[PDB]
């Protein structure tokens, strides 16, 4: 057992000074004044570093030089484990491996792989995020059109039956029957609107059917016009809908992120939507059946189409603070508590309180990771 001391502790609700977090049995035992700490307990000094619950990334296609996409070879438990070690280097202790628009078979393997993974590693990769294939071609983005299709009773049923390892499914509401959304949500899956050209009216129908989240706000959505707010405008106008936003300063202009934060409040979540280049050093990689190039901080195919990002959660936190005028504590919530509540895991993750899983990360004022703790174990030490 041990206690982390001498550092600013962010519980999710406030910053504490002169306190210590005692971690025992992979769980956070308590957070209280350092002066009430029993004697001889090994104290781990944070050395002034900020201590926060581990970041939670709800949209991640790949990182650490690998992708959990495209092939049966890459859609494996080993990939999941690799992506986890890479995330940890960036303070990210949890994520939703995201498998995009692909064949029925690859989706089934992804489900089997997720399930196998869960049995071996708890409180890490939390569950699958299936982005596709029920999208709108007009907003397919970098997805392979040969796989963008309409929903079948068989696939729909398979997902619902495997809801226990499927955290979320992103789909275009105007491309699927309301019944499909309701069925998925009733099974326990978070249904999110994304890669849609839906009008505001269509978007609202999707919300009423069971959609409670939206994938990477602005991206793969209609632009906003005076008379047609579209899905983006609808999400902004609907206080109950949570949503992710890629904060790399490349996918979305910081001004739109600021406007989005003001309008979404505690419902805006930080996501990386990263790819293999994130937390690694590579020049190119494969994605959506194409060759993607990492040229100038961008991940684009030969046609210049953005294909995911190379952003890490700690970099996202930093950008939101330095460029979007959002307080550190609020930014930390966008990367922890908010995404945790969006996917229903706040009872065990998202804050530094007694009983919660011991997943944390520590960084210095310059936003450099000094520690990362998974299930009470310090996997990163810098």
Ligand X SMILES: CP(=O)(O)N[C@@H]1[C@@H](O)[C@H](O)[C@@H](COP(=O)(O)O)O[C@@H]1O
Of a second copy, ligand X, none, which one does residue 228 interact with (CB within 5 to 8 Å by kind)? Answer: a second copy
Strand 242-246 versus strand 290-295 pairing type: unpaired
Contact in structure between 247 and 320 (CB atoms under 8 Å):
yes
Shortest reach from residue 303's CB to ligand X, in Å: 10
Shortest reach from residue 352's CB to ligand X, in Å: 31
For the stretch 285-288, contacts whose Cβ atoms lie closer than 8 Å and that sit 24 or more positions apart, written own/partner, are: 285/62, 285/65, 285/67, 286/67, 286/70, 287/61, 287/62, 287/67, 287/69, 287/70, 287/142, 288/69, 288/70, 288/100, 288/101, 288/142, 288/143, 288/144
Residue with tokens 């050093």: 281
Q: Is the Cβ of residue 51 or residue 234 nearer to a second copy in the bound state?
A: 234
For ligand X, the binding residues in 225-244 under the rule CB under 6 A are 226
What is the C-alpha to C-alpha distance for residues 215 and 321, in angstroms, rounded to an integer? 22
Shortest reach from residue 2's CB to a second copy, in Å: 45
Beta bridge partners of 190: 168
Q: Is the Cβ of residue 227 or residue 303 nearer to a second copy in the bound state?
A: 227
Shortest reach from residue 347's CB to ligand X, in Å: 28
Q: Round to the nearest angstrom and report the end-to-end CA distance of the chain.
A: 21
Q: Is the Cβ of residue 39 or residue 226 nearer to ligand X in the bound state?
A: 226
CA-to-CA dists, residue 308 to 100, 151, 158, 249, 293, angstroms? 11, 24, 27, 13, 11
Of a second copy, ligand X, none, which one does residue 142 interact with (CB within 5 to 8 Å by kind)? Answer: ligand X
Q: Contacting ligand X (CB under 6 A), which of 30, 109, 199, 305?
A: 305
Using rule CB under 6 A, residue 123 touches ligand X:
no
For ligand X, the binding residues in 185-224 under the rule CB under 6 A are 216, 219-220
Shortest reach from residue 246's CB to ligand X, in Å: 7
Residue with tokens 């269509």: 202
Using rule CB under 6 A, residue 251 touches ligand X:
yes
Angle, CA 225 vertex, CA 220 and CA 227 arms, to 5°: 125
Q: Is the Cβ of residue 263 or residue 286 nearer to a second copy in the bound state?
A: 263
Q: Contacting ligand X (CB under 6 A), which of 308, 316, 339, 350?
A: 308
Q: Contacting ligand X (CB under 6 A), which of 20, 21, 100, 268?
A: 100
Shortest reach from residue 194's CB to ligand X, in Å: 7
The span of 9-17, 117-125, 136-144, 310-318 binding ligand X (CB under 6 A) equals 136-144
Beta bridge partners of 285: 292
Cis peptide before 133 (omega within 30 of 0): yes
For the stretch 291-298, contacts whose Cβ atoms lie closer than 8 Å and that sit 24 or more positions apart, written own/partner, are: 292/142, 297/248, 297/250, 298/250
DSSP letter at 37 equals: P
What is the C-alpha to C-alpha distance for residues 368 and 177, in angstroms, rounded to an integer? 46
Using rule CB under 6 A, residue 7 touches ligand X:
no
Q: Is the Cβ of residue 143 or residue 261 nearer to ligand X in the bound state?
A: 143
Shortest reach from residue 252's CB to a second copy, in Å: 5
Residue nearest to ligand X (CB): 141
Of a second copy, ligand X, none, which one does residue 62 interact with (CB within 5 to 8 Å by kind)? Answer: none
Using rule CB under 6 A, residue 66 touches ligand X:
no
- Residues of the shown chain interacting with ligand X in the complex, contacts defined by CB under 6 A: 61, 100, 131, 141-143, 216, 219-220, 226, 251, 273, 305-308
């Amino acid at each position: 057992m041990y206690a982390l001391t001498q550092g600013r502790i962010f519980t999710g609700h406030e910053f504490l000074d002169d306190h210590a977090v005692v971690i025992a049995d992979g769980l956070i035992k308590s957070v209280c004044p350092v002066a009430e700490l029993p004697p001889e307990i090994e104290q781990r000094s944070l050395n002034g570093a900020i201590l926060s619950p581990g970041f939670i990334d709800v949209q991640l296609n790949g990182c650490g030089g690998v992708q959990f996409n495209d092939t049966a070879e890459a859609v494996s438990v080993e990939t999941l484990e690799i992506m986890q070690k890479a995330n940890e280097k960036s303070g990210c202790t949890n994520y939703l491996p995201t498998l995009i628009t692909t064949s029925d078979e690859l989706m089934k393997q992804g489900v089997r792989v997720m399930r196998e993974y869960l049995a071996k590693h708890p409180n890490q990769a939390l569950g699958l995020h299936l982005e596709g294939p029920w999208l709108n071609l007009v907003k397919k983005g970098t997805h392979n059109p040969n796989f963008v299709r309409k929903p079948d009773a068989a696939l729909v049923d398979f997902l619902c039956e495997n809801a226990d390892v499927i955290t979320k499914v992103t789909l275009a509401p105007e491309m699927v029957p309301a019944e499909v959304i309701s069925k998925l949500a009733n099974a326990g899956i978070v249904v999110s609107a994304g890669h849609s050209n839906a009008t505001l009216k269509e978007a609202k129908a999707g919300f009423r059917a069971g959609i409670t989240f939206a994938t990477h706000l602005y991206n793969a959505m209609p632009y906003i016009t005076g008379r047609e707010p579209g899905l983006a405008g609808a999400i902004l106008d609907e206080a109950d809908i949570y949503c992710g936003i890629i904060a790399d300063g490349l996918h979305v202009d910081y001004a739109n992120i600021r406007n989005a934060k003001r309008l979404k409040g505690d419902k805006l979540c930080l996501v990386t939507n990263a790819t293999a280049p994130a937390g690694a050093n590579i020049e190119q990689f494969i994605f959506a059946g194409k060759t993607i190039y990492y040229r100038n901080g961008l991940c684009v195919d030969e046609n210049g189409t953005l294909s995911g990002s190379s952003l890490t959660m700690i970099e996202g936190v930093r950008n939101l603070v330095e460029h979007c005028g959002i307080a550190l504590d609020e930014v930390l919530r966008m990367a922890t508590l908010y995404p945790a509540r969006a996917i229903g895991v706040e009872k065990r993750l998202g804050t530094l309180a007694a009983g919660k899983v011991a997943n944390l990360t520590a960084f210095t004022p310059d936003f450099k990771i000094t520690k990362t703790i998974v299930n009470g174990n310090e996997v990163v030490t810098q």
